[PDB]
Design a protein around this motif. Structure first.
Motif, PDB file in Angstrom:
ATOM      1  N   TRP A  12       0.823  -1.200   0.000  1.00  0.00           N
ATOM      2  CA  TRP A  12       0.000   0.000   0.000  1.00  0.00           C
ATOM      3  C   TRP A  12       0.860   1.254   0.000  1.00  0.00           C
ATOM      4  O   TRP A  12       0.372   2.334  -0.348  1.00  0.00           O
ATOM      5  CB  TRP A  12      -0.928  -0.009   1.216  1.00  0.00           C
ATOM      6  N   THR A  65     -10.735   9.222   2.033  1.00  0.00           N
ATOM      7  CA  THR A  65     -10.188   8.000   2.597  1.00  0.00           C
ATOM      8  C   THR A  65     -10.426   7.929   4.099  1.00  0.00           C
ATOM      9  O   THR A  65     -10.053   6.940   4.738  1.00  0.00           O
ATOM     10  CB  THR A  65      -8.686   7.906   2.272  1.00  0.00           C
ATOM     11  N   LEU A  66     -11.092   8.936   4.663  1.00  0.00           N
ATOM     12  CA  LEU A  66     -11.450   8.957   6.072  1.00  0.00           C
ATOM     13  C   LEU A  66     -12.949   9.000   6.319  1.00  0.00           C
ATOM     14  O   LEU A  66     -13.409   8.422   7.309  1.00  0.00           O
ATOM     15  CB  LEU A  66     -10.805  10.168   6.766  1.00  0.00           C
ATOM     16  N   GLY A 121     -13.951   5.397   6.010  1.00  0.00           N
ATOM     17  CA  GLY A 121     -13.528   4.672   7.195  1.00  0.00           C
ATOM     18  C   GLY A 121     -14.441   4.922   8.377  1.00  0.00           C
ATOM     19  O   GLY A 121     -14.825   3.989   9.088  1.00  0.00           O
ATOM     20  N   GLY A 122     -14.801   6.187   8.605  1.00  0.00           N
ATOM     21  CA  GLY A 122     -15.713   6.497   9.693  1.00  0.00           C
ATOM     22  C   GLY A 122     -17.063   5.830   9.516  1.00  0.00           C
ATOM     23  O   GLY A 122     -17.630   5.291  10.468  1.00  0.00           O
ATOM     24  N   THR A 144     -13.044   2.383  -0.268  1.00  0.00           N
ATOM     25  CA  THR A 144     -12.588   2.258   1.109  1.00  0.00           C
ATOM     26  C   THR A 144     -13.702   1.735   1.998  1.00  0.00           C
ATOM     27  O   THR A 144     -13.458   0.892   2.871  1.00  0.00           O
ATOM     28  CB  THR A 144     -12.089   3.610   1.621  1.00  0.00           C
ATOM     29  N   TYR A 173     -13.773  -2.040   1.016  1.00  0.00           N
ATOM     30  CA  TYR A 173     -12.644  -2.782   1.563  1.00  0.00           C
ATOM     31  C   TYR A 173     -12.793  -2.964   3.067  1.00  0.00           C
ATOM     32  O   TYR A 173     -12.642  -4.077   3.584  1.00  0.00           O
ATOM     33  CB  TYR A 173     -11.332  -2.073   1.232  1.00  0.00           C
ATOM     34  N   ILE A 174     -13.111  -1.885   3.789  1.00  0.00           N
ATOM     35  CA  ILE A 174     -13.191  -1.987   5.242  1.00  0.00           C
ATOM     36  C   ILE A 174     -14.300  -2.946   5.651  1.00  0.00           C
ATOM     37  O   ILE A 174     -14.121  -3.770   6.556  1.00  0.00           O
ATOM     38  CB  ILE A 174     -13.385  -0.598   5.875  1.00  0.00           C
ATOM     39  N   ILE A 193     -10.433  -1.812  13.621  1.00  0.00           N
ATOM     40  CA  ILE A 193      -9.597  -0.678  13.997  1.00  0.00           C
ATOM     41  C   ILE A 193      -8.135  -0.970  13.692  1.00  0.00           C
ATOM     42  O   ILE A 193      -7.400  -0.098  13.217  1.00  0.00           O
ATOM     43  CB  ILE A 193      -9.809  -0.329  15.482  1.00  0.00           C
ATOM     44  N   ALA A 204      -7.495  -0.744  10.078  1.00  0.00           N
ATOM     45  CA  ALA A 204      -7.529   0.630   9.590  1.00  0.00           C
ATOM     46  C   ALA A 204      -6.245   1.365   9.949  1.00  0.00           C
ATOM     47  O   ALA A 204      -5.654   2.056   9.110  1.00  0.00           O
ATOM     48  CB  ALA A 204      -8.748   1.361  10.149  1.00  0.00           C
ATOM     49  N   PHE A 221      -3.487   2.795   7.289  1.00  0.00           N
ATOM     50  CA  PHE A 221      -3.198   4.223   7.247  1.00  0.00           C
ATOM     51  C   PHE A 221      -1.799   4.581   7.732  1.00  0.00           C
ATOM     52  O   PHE A 221      -1.392   5.738   7.587  1.00  0.00           O
ATOM     53  CB  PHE A 221      -4.231   5.003   8.071  1.00  0.00           C
TER      54      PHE A 221
END
Ligand code: STE
Ligand code: PLM
Ligand code: PLM
Ligand code: D10
Lengths: 385, 385
Positions: B44, B71-72, B75-76, B129, B132-133, B144, B147, B151
């Motif tokens: 990555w 990209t955040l 994730g959130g 994202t 994927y998550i 977590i 992630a 990152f």
């Protein structure tokens, strides 16, 4: 917003397709995936759906073919270099890093070229697959297992991306060129009358769209040669280029409407009282040209041939009456007192400029008519009757 | 190959910098890392450089901000739904599938709004994202951890990219907008001279580039606001918006050169014998206009103020002299025997349109001079001593 959807329900259908495809993928991996190996690399299929799903069938097909060519060539080169590296023992890394450097430089120099530009995605896929394949396997020796595993997990994602796009509600790319060619004629017809009325009173987009759409028609023609025969288009080689030829013939005529609109926005203008002497002829020419353009657009929309009667008779007669009137009252344009203020002379000559531009517009229609005849002859249009 | 490898060494430097960045990442992955603890998570960081390396320093920063908000947010979302699905003990994967469907639909819909083009990369990163998550971490308590791990490496790849791009050789967009303006100033003058030379014979590229580049200037202005002060552009808020005004004034002035080029390619033309009567004045007007445009371009290039003398005095005299000539020989453009064929009348009348359009071009220069004065006043140009 909701308004955009209501106006264009098609986009909602596209979003629904994307969602159904991602749901199918997700379910196929959440349940029907007993093999543990796939679990290790099962997040490789739901990432090939967000990149190969396009709005049209031709774009999807061509871009997928390009991406697959790039991926295959990159994988082959990577595996070849990996195998060849073993010869120089104890110096593997000092070879693989020079390889990644040469290949990054090369795959970066060829994209910056204008001919090879517009195909970046393929070079990016090639560089990413080369770096991935080189770095991943390394000493472990699994340079081929990883390759075949991922190629065979990508293939399923691309198949599920293609089937849903092609078999639910196809959005073909050969009908957007037909509808844009139809729309350009009406835009130009509206623009001409708008300009004439604006000049005779006491547009912008209309000619920009016709003059600023060649690239869109070339992309739509690049995507339309990939689609199979369907609907009204049954021949195996549809003359998609005659639409572009007719569009160019129409843009050459729209340049004069652009020049007339620029004539309306000039610094030096003429007194209204002088312009009100030629109103009738200009209005007749504008009406006749708008009627001709709308008739040509209507005959292009219905896929019909031209009738026996001549369509340019009335506009030609109107332009001849305009010329006669201009010849009869030419003393209002030049200064006859002196014959062997600059602003007054420019104001006088702006009317002759406007009339000359209108006459050139009326004179540029025969090329469009000939292009339409050629298109209606090569595309097997039906008899008007 | 050698054509641009020798005519533009900027691309060879760009490619060499991307190669050096890839080589640095590869050596840091292969040598520094003591053992294969992250062998599969160490890509990555060698796949972000290929997607974060741009030509200019402001495009990298802006696209990085966008990709680091996209990209955040995903994730959130994923982390806030993986702690809510648990409530539905029985329907777990069904709820995750409905979540994927809804989120994909929403993102695809919000990616097609006509206001949101030029950001597809952000929505693509958001969807990839979230997918994927949600898919990769299932039941296994590693959301977590997965992630944080994913990152902790993209940040190093981005740091290496933004250190190589910036500290080895930087390409700025504020030094490209200036050069684009100078090039447009030169091209417009070259086209103006070419048009008159072609008309008086016994161009396209210039105005076509100076009239079809507003998007490039807007992009360069959008990228140049992110860069820190450097070189001669030493100020917290450089007035980068005063270059676009001058470019627009020059485009408005170049529309008349485009209209004269269209006049050259018209279907109705005047006889040569009548054309040769006005050669001198047209040549003088063209020479004066080209000299003025080149002077303004050279003044823009050197970042200098205008002197104390008037720069339009000579062309204003030339355009006046031409008018006088038109007054003396008007009988060569109108028929004075009918005051109370069409082709001959139109051929005679075209000369007044060409001469009257050159008067408009000469009249449109005051706006460009005013825009130059405003730019030189807001940008703190130096005295031309
Ligand atoms: C568009 C983004 C591309 C990202 C792809 C990541 C890496 C893909 C792995 C591809 C593995 C299959 C490559 C082909 C290997 C077989 C080639 C052969 O030897 O003939
Ligand atoms: C993360 C990878 C994204 C890009 C992957 C490449 C694009 C998919 C290409 C699939 C090609 C499948 C084979 C095409 C020819 C065939 O139909 O047999
Ligand atoms: C293809 C790029 C996406 C895959 C990488 C995803 C890594 C996770 C994204 C950041 C998660 C943000 C949520 C907070 C993370 C934290 O607690 O540190
Ligand atoms: C893979 C998409 C780009 C993610 C990185 C964004 C740059 C800043 C990361 C802190």
């Amino acid at each position: 917003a909701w308004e955009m959807g209501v106006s264009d329900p098609r986009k909602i259908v596209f979003s629904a397709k994307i969602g159904l495809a991602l749901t199918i993928v997700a379910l196929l991996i959440f349940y029907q995936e007993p093999n543990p190996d796939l679990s290790r690399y099962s997040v490789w299929a739901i990432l090939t759906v967000v990149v190969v799903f396009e709005f049209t069938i031709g774009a999807t097909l061509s871009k997928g073919f390009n991406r697959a060519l790039g991926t295959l060539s990159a994988g082959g080169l990577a595996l070849g270099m990996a195998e060849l590296s073993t010869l120089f023992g104890d110096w593997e890394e000092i070879f693989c890093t020079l390889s990644i450097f040469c290949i990054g430089f090369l795959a970066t120099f060829m994209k910056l070229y204008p001919s090879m530009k517009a195909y970046e995605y393929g070079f990016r896929v090639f560089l990413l697959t080369y770096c991935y394949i080189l770095i991943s396997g390394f000493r472990t020796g699994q340079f081929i297992e990883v390759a075949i595993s991922r190629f065979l997990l990508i293939a399923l994602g691309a198949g599920v991306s293609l089937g849903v796009n092609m078999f639910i509600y196809p959005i073909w790319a050969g009908e957007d060129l037909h509808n844009l060619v139809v729309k350009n004629f009406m835009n130009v017809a509206t623009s001409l009358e708008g300009c004439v009325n604006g000049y005779l009173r006491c547009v912008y987009k209309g000619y920009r769209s016709a003059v600023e759409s060649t690239s869109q028609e070339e992309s739509l023609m690049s995507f339309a040669i990939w689609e199979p025969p369907h609907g009204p288009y049954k021949s195996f080689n549809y003359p998609w280029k005659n639409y572009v030829k007719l569009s160019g013939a129409l843009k050459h005529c729209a340049f004069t409407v652009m020049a007339l609109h620029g004539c309306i926005l000039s610094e030096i203008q003429a007194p209204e009282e002088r312009r009100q002497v030629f109103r009738q002829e200009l209005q007749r020419v504008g009406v006749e040209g708008a009627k001709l353009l709308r008739e040509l657009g209507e005959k292009v929309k219905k896929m019909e041939k031209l009738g026996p009667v001549d369509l340019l008779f009335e506009v030609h007669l109107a332009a001849e009456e305009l010329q006669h009137k201009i010849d009869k009252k030419s003393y209002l344009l030049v200064n006859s007192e002196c014959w062997e203020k600059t602003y007054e002379s420019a104001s006088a000559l702006s009317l002759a400029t406007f009339a000359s531009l209108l006459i050139e517009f009326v004179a540029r229609l025969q090329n469009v008519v000939d292009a339409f005849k050629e298109l209606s002859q090569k595309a097997n249009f039906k008899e008007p009757e």
